[PDB]
Symmetry: D2
Subunit: 56 residues, 4 copies
C-alpha cells in the first residue's frame, strides 16, 4: 500500500518555537522506526511529473 503524507513545517505568522513535520524529521523517524523491522536504503526523489493547469 502506498501512503501519502505531506510534511513541510507549514509556515505561518507567529514565530512559533519548534517544528514537527520536517522533511528531515520524516526521514529520521520513518527510517529509525522502520529500521527496527529490517528496512534500509536511502531516500530517492520520485520521477518528475507534469500537470496541466487550467486558465482560459
Amino acid at each position: 500500500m502506498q501512503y501519502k503524507v505531506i510534511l513541510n513545517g507549514k509556515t505561518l505568522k507567529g514565530e512559533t518555537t519548534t517544528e514537527a513535520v520536517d522533511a528531515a524529521t520524516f526521514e529520521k523517524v520513518v527510517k529509525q522506526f522502520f529500521n527496527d523491522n529490517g528496512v534500509d536504503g536511502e531516500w530517492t526523489y520520485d520521477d518528475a511529473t507534469k500537470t496541466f493547469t487550467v486558465t482560459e
Copy 2:
C-alpha cells in the same frame, strides 16, 4: 513536501516473524506520532487514477 511510503505486510513464504509495515501500523504510528504536534482528521483514499500498460 509529499512523502511516498509503501507499507504492505507481504509474507508469501518464510519464517513466522512479524511485519511492522502494516497499513494499520502506519495510520496508528503516523497519527499518534504527528498528533503530538497538533495534527488530526482521518485517512482518506486518494483520487482514482488510470495508467496505460504497454503490451504489443
Copy 3:
C-alpha cells in the same frame, strides 16, 4: 516522463449539451494517437493510495 491529465466531463448546471474530456475519449484518442507509433496494451488502474486529510 510522466504526464498528469484530469479528464472528467463533470456538469453542475443543467445544459450539458456535450462533452470532450471523457474517460473513454482519452483511452480512444490516446490509444489511437499513440498506436500510430507502435504502442498497445490496455488501460490498467493505478495502485491504491491513501492520503491523510487534516481536520482538528
Copy 4:
C-alpha cells in the same frame, strides 16, 4: 479522473525515422486536442515527492 501517461523520447536502439511519445508532442497534441473544447493555460510541474528505496 486523473490519467497517467508516460511519454519519453528514449529510443536508444534503432535508427532515425520518427517519434510520437515526445514531451513536446503531448503538450501540443493534448493542448491542441483539448483546446477545441475550451481548455487553456500552461503545463505546470507537479509537486516534488520523495520515495524510499529499499536496499539492506
